[PDB]
Design an enzyme around this catalytic site. Sequence first.
Site, PDB file in Angstrom:
ATOM      1  N   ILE A   1       0.841  -1.190   0.000  1.00  0.00           N
ATOM      2  CA  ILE A   1       0.000   0.000   0.000  1.00  0.00           C
ATOM      3  C   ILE A   1       0.879   1.244   0.000  1.00  0.00           C
ATOM      4  O   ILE A   1       1.343   1.681   1.057  1.00  0.00           O
ATOM      5  CB  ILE A   1      -0.904   0.071   1.242  1.00  0.00           C
ATOM      6  CG1 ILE A   1      -1.861  -1.118   1.267  1.00  0.00           C
ATOM      7  CG2 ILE A   1      -1.689   1.378   1.234  1.00  0.00           C
ATOM      8  CD1 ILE A   1      -2.815  -1.096   2.445  1.00  0.00           C
ATOM      9  N   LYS A   2       1.110   1.807  -1.184  1.00  0.00           N
ATOM     10  CA  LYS A   2       1.926   3.011  -1.307  1.00  0.00           C
ATOM     11  C   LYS A   2       1.113   4.223  -0.874  1.00  0.00           C
ATOM     12  O   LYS A   2      -0.027   4.389  -1.300  1.00  0.00           O
ATOM     13  CB  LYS A   2       2.385   3.192  -2.754  1.00  0.00           C
ATOM     14  CG  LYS A   2       3.093   4.507  -3.011  1.00  0.00           C
ATOM     15  CD  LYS A   2       3.556   4.619  -4.449  1.00  0.00           C
ATOM     16  CE  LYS A   2       4.227   5.959  -4.687  1.00  0.00           C
ATOM     17  NZ  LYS A   2       4.790   6.062  -6.050  1.00  0.00           N
TER      18      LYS A   2
ATOM     19  N   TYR B   1     -11.930  -0.675 -21.753  1.00  0.00           N
ATOM     20  CA  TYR B   1     -12.352  -2.054 -21.524  1.00  0.00           C
ATOM     21  C   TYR B   1     -13.830  -2.243 -21.882  1.00  0.00           C
ATOM     22  O   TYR B   1     -14.650  -1.345 -21.672  1.00  0.00           O
ATOM     23  CB  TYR B   1     -12.143  -2.453 -20.055  1.00  0.00           C
ATOM     24  CG  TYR B   1     -10.854  -3.210 -19.772  1.00  0.00           C
ATOM     25  CD1 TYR B   1     -10.806  -4.185 -18.778  1.00  0.00           C
ATOM     26  CD2 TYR B   1      -9.687  -2.947 -20.493  1.00  0.00           C
ATOM     27  CE1 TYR B   1      -9.631  -4.883 -18.506  1.00  0.00           C
ATOM     28  CE2 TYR B   1      -8.504  -3.642 -20.227  1.00  0.00           C
ATOM     29  CZ  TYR B   1      -8.487  -4.609 -19.233  1.00  0.00           C
ATOM     30  OH  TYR B   1      -7.325  -5.309 -18.965  1.00  0.00           O
TER      31      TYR B   1
ATOM     32  N   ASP C   1      -6.148   1.354 -10.336  1.00  0.00           N
ATOM     33  CA  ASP C   1      -4.848   2.011 -10.281  1.00  0.00           C
ATOM     34  C   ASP C   1      -4.340   2.283 -11.700  1.00  0.00           C
ATOM     35  O   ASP C   1      -3.867   3.387 -11.988  1.00  0.00           O
ATOM     36  CB  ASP C   1      -3.840   1.150  -9.514  1.00  0.00           C
ATOM     37  CG  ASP C   1      -3.702  -0.240 -10.093  1.00  0.00           C
ATOM     38  OD1 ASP C   1      -2.696  -0.917  -9.785  1.00  0.00           O
ATOM     39  OD2 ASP C   1      -4.600  -0.666 -10.851  1.00  0.00           O
TER      40      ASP C   1
ATOM     41  N   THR D   1       5.538  -5.102  -9.249  1.00  0.00           N
ATOM     42  CA  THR D   1       5.579  -6.529  -8.950  1.00  0.00           C
ATOM     43  C   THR D   1       5.015  -7.213 -10.190  1.00  0.00           C
ATOM     44  O   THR D   1       5.510  -8.244 -10.645  1.00  0.00           O
ATOM     45  CB  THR D   1       4.728  -6.844  -7.698  1.00  0.00           C
ATOM     46  OG1 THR D   1       5.371  -6.282  -6.545  1.00  0.00           O
ATOM     47  CG2 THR D   1       4.576  -8.338  -7.498  1.00  0.00           C
TER      48      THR D   1
END
EC number: 2.7.1.33
Lengths: 241, 248
Positions: free
Chosen positions: B13-14, B93, B102, B125
């Site tokens: 969690i940045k 989308y 995000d 990641t």
Amino acid sequence: ASMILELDCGNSLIKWRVIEGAARSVAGGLAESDDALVEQLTSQQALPVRACRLVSVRSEQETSQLVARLEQLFPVSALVASSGKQLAGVRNGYLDYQRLGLDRWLALVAAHHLAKKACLVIDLGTAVTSDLVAADGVHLGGYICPGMTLMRSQLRDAEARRALASLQPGQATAEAVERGCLLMLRGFVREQYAMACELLGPDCEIFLTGGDAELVRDELAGARIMPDLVFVGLALACPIE
Amino acid sequence: SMILELDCGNSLIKWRVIEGAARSVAGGLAESDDALVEQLTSQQALPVRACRLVSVRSEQETSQLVARLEQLFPVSALVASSGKQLAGVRNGYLDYQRLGLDRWLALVAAHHLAKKACLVIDLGTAVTSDLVAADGVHLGGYICPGMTLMRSQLRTHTRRIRYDDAEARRALASLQPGQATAEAVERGCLLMLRGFVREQYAMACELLGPDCEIFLTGGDAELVRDELAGARIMPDLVFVGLALACPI
């Protein structure tokens, strides 16, 4: 006559085949487990198998077990390929020759044996590997990265092939992942070709193997696709009669 | 009064605290809902009087994080939500809600800043890439593993792949053929990463024009930026979008 049972024991799969003569395959398969393997082989005990050779990247104990099950299903004394500093005029490039996965080793040796020139050897399997060998038979070293399978089961066949019908931006989860990963794989292959051109010269021979070779062969027009490359090397490592 | 901003990913969690419009004065990566609430304790003082965040977690876990926050600060938290359009950018989308929030806020921020077609890649990641036409229309994107995920996959695949961080860092000093496991693995994965980025750049020149702007975000942006000298590296891209999604 007598036939030969050959096997490649990977980390998550076991590929096998029975050949007549020097290299004519008359049967073979892919086992996701030893039980599946025994299941498949049991249906071929009708074949005159009288010799056996194999390569494995599994533990010394796990291999001996498999060998035991094999020597039970067929009247043979299984030959097992082992590490070496050299084989068929090819020099192992690892600091510690034993650290090189045996599957990669036999395939790259097979490639140079066949080409007698510098070559780029890429195995597009569960995991992806790429090795480069100089024209003089000296292995420079190689690379390892995940394959489509590993990349998938982490972020998530006729349906997947549908998502891959285009490599344009995905507009849905399935499309984004499948196209993302394939573009990553295709990208890796181009980086390998570029590296080979630089260290081996633009005219180096290219060898592709593994079940996903088809997904990237269009990138290298002259690449040689050889599903059984490792088995070519296995014959060199474990010669029979 | 300052604003607390958070980006709740699947794992870490940045967060950050900003004074005025966007001057960051504190922040950090909390690998867990716990390594956060307390993490807002260590270097503390900052008088936050507002808060906004974007989250890709269960509406459960969301308020689970919003919980220990609504108590630590006298603020009525603002949460970003999915949308078919934001700040002149159109979600690409088929089901606008399936797009990672995000990613969405980061690509919107990119077009908002460029007002041109852009390529937006997040090297974290996991790695994501999105393309936006000059008219603000999101064409869609790609998802694939990042360095840590690739290592994780290989580690799980075989016990033969295990080494120290020191040996790992040592390996990246060159991209030539590896002659040991750490060298083959680290260089292999990085080449795959660098390879993916070159494919994305090619795809962008194709669909957007060679003139498109390139935005790089995520902690591993440094490993690939040399491939795109003109690239705009923005570690806080997602927060530019959060302000657009939740104005204060």
